[PDB]
Amino acid sequence: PEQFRIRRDKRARLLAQGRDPYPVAVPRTHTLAEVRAAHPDLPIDTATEDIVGVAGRVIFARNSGKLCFATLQDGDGTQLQVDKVGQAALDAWKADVDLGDIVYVHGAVISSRLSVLADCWRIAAKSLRPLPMSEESRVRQRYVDLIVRPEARAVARLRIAVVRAIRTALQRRGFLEVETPVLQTLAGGAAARPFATHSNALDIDLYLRIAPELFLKRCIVGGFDKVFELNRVFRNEGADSTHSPEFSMLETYQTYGTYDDSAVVTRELIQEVADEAIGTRQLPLPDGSVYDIDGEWATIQMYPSLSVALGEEITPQTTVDRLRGIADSLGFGHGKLIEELWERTVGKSLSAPTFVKDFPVQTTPLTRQHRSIPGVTEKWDLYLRGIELATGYSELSDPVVQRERFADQARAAMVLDEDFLAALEYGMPPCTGTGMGIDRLLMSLTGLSIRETVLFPI
């Protein structure tokens, strides 16, 4: 709080002296990891003439008369420590260097009684704020978090690897990644309230996408065989531990397969991700426990599993009056009640990775009706560690069914998405699409909160 000002004084008295505390270029020859990997086993307390120029943040200090010692930490976490050359050097070192400062050191690498002893040295950046964190002050200052807490570094890097692993996996299977509009004249593809924004260009409101599905489906019409899109969607609603207004989401579409096929791919995908990004399918948790995601995953059906849980045959024919009865005895329409009752009974119990499939028609307007069973659609949800993570559909390609479905939805709350429906009636071949939530994915894999999985939330 005071040291704020002495640092700012250290800046000004360097400019006046004509020593640059924010130089344009310092000749860093090696990352610290490069130096460590280069000199793994080294005779302790012995010299080597490998001259190198390294840089890093001075995090520890121990000044002492003729020799000074400080730990240098590169941005990724790696560490190297630092008569030699000049006395004024040491004077400047003492008087100019503070903790949190970025410094360059040229010299030869030696082994401590793994350090480097300096020919030259320079400031690369002057810190006007010493380093210190509540979980919320962590999020509001991620940049400090990443500097001073290792786990922040590992989580950031893990998200990145997971996202790369996803691209790899889909690309290996012959999927093409596409960019579809964020700004739309009307936002569809999911059930949520949009963010609205006004355009100076057109003097109209546009709406940020809630999902890419409707546009992705146009691509399938247009002759894409296999397409995906990994990017942010926007749902103007409340925040909780599994919901945020902006988050990253994966949609996948594949022609000439069903929800049976996309279920297999989804499993393989998640498993292939663990392998690449985490290295095990026996997933360690902060709990201390281990979650096993290996092998095969159980598939249940919604109506039957709900039936066993309630001890009574529930079907698509079961009335809202009856459902409401059961809803009460525990604590709008048919579909909503089935999913609610199922979630409160079956989905809450689940631990092992589980698919639930065959969903009520009311609440699934974009998914095809089931091939044999009446009253249900070909949709699955994937629960992983009790987290709704992913869905897949046998996609409805029937435009007149689809027009009805929207009309039913519109009257319930009349402007339909006429261009989407127009596209469907040029002919969309049979396909299965999936959605997956990236943070929920990581959450399910790690036990980490949504406020840790993304770099910069609010």
Ligand X SMILES: CCOc1nc(N)nc2c1c(=O)n(C1CCCCCC1)n2CCC1CNC1
Token pair for 156: 């950031």
From the list 84-92, 108-116, 345-353, 389-397, the region that binds a copy of itself by CB under 8 A is: 389-397
From the list 148-156, 202-210, 308-316, 384-392, the region that binds ligand X by CB under 6 A is: 384-392
User: Is 388 annotated as a binding-site member?
Assistant: yes
Phi, psi of 112 (to 5 degrees): -70, 150
Q: Does 341 bind ligand X (CB under 6 A)?
A: no
Shortest Cβ distance from residue 56 to ligand X (Å)?
A: 31
Shortest Cβ distance from residue 407 to a copy of itself (Å)?
A: 16
Beta bridge partners of 394: 432
Question: Please, which residues have CB within 8 angstroms of residue 434's CB and are 6 or more apart in sequence?
Answer: 250, 251, 252, 262, 265, 266, 390, 391, 392, 393
Q: Does 426 bind a copy of itself (CB under 8 A)?
A: yes
Sign of the dihedral defined by the CA atoms of residues 335, 337, 341, 344, in that order: positive
Residue 37 interacting partner from ligand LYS, a copy of itself, ligand X, none (CB closer than 5 to 8 Å by kind): none
How far is residue 56 from each of residues 32, 153, 275, measured CA to CA in Å? Answer: 8, 16, 32
How far is residue 446 from each of residues 74, 238, 242, 426, measured CA to CA in Å? Answer: 26, 24, 14, 44
Q: Does 389 bind ligand X (CB under 6 A)?
A: yes
Shortest Cβ distance from residue 398 to a copy of itself (Å)?
A: 4
Q: Which of residues 114-153 bind a copy of itself (CB under 8 A)?
A: 124-129, 131, 140-147, 153
Size of residue set near ligand X by CB under 6 A: 16
Shortest Cβ distance from residue 48 to a copy of itself (Å)?
A: 23
**What is the SS3 assignment for 118?**
strand
Relative to beta strand 298-301, strand 354-360 is parallel
Angle at 69 between CA 97 and CA 36, to 5 degrees: 105
Q: Does 74 bind a copy of itself (CB under 8 A)?
A: yes
**What is the SS3 assignment for 69?**
strand
Shortest Cβ distance from residue 339 to ligand X (Å)?
A: 8
Q: Does 379 bind a copy of itself (CB under 8 A)?
A: no
Q: Which of 17, 48, 112, 199 binds a copy of itself (CB under 8 A)?
A: 199
Q: Does 398 bind a copy of itself (CB under 8 A)?
A: yes
Tell me the one-letter amino acid at 95. Answer: A
For ligand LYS, the closer CB: 358 or 395? 395
Shortest Cβ distance from residue 181 to a copy of itself (Å)?
A: 5
Sites of contact with ligand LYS (CB under 6 A): 189-190, 211, 213, 251, 366, 391, 393, 395, 433-435
Residue 213 interacting partner from ligand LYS, a copy of itself, ligand X, none (CB closer than 5 to 8 Å by kind): ligand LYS
Shortest Cβ distance from residue 211 to ligand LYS (Å)?
A: 3
Question: Please, which residues have CB within 8 angstroms of residue 267's CB and are 6 or more apart in sequence?
Answer: 296, 297, 353
Contact between 374 and 361 under an 8 Å Cβ cutoff? The reply is: no
Q: Which of 159, 235, 334, 368 binds ligand X (CB under 6 A)?
A: 235
Shortest Cβ distance from residue 112 to ligand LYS (Å)?
A: 39
Distance of CA 126 to the CA centre of its chain: 33
- The rounded distance, in Å, linking the Cα atoms of 296 and 312 is 29
Q: Does 107 bind a copy of itself (CB under 8 A)?
A: no
Shortest Cβ distance from residue 415 to ligand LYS (Å)?
A: 20
Q: Does 285 bind a copy of itself (CB under 8 A)?
A: no
The candidate with the shortest Cα–Cα distance to 84, out of 116, 56, 114, 55, is 116
Q: Does 265 bind ligand X (CB under 6 A)?
A: no
Question: Please, which residues have CB within 8 angstroms of residue 166's CB and are 6 or more apart in sequence?
Answer: 230, 250, 269, 273
For ligand X, the closer CB: 104 or 253? 253
Token pair for 167: 């691209």
- The rounded distance, in Å, linking the Cα atoms of 142 and 137 is 8
Residue 255 interacting partner from ligand X, ligand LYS, a copy of itself, none (CB closer than 5 to 8 Å by kind): a copy of itself
Contact between 59 and 99 under an 8 Å Cβ cutoff? The reply is: yes
Residue 222 interacting partner from ligand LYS, ligand X, a copy of itself, none (CB closer than 5 to 8 Å by kind): a copy of itself
- The rounded distance, in Å, linking the Cα atoms of 376 and 358 is 6
Contact between 23 and 29 under an 8 Å Cβ cutoff? The reply is: no
Q: Does 14 bind a copy of itself (CB under 8 A)?
A: no
Instruction: Report the binding-site residues for Mg(2+).
Output: 381, 388
Residues that bind ligand X (CB under 6 A): 235, 237, 243-244, 247, 249, 388-391, 435-437, 439-440, 450
* Binding annotation: 381, 388
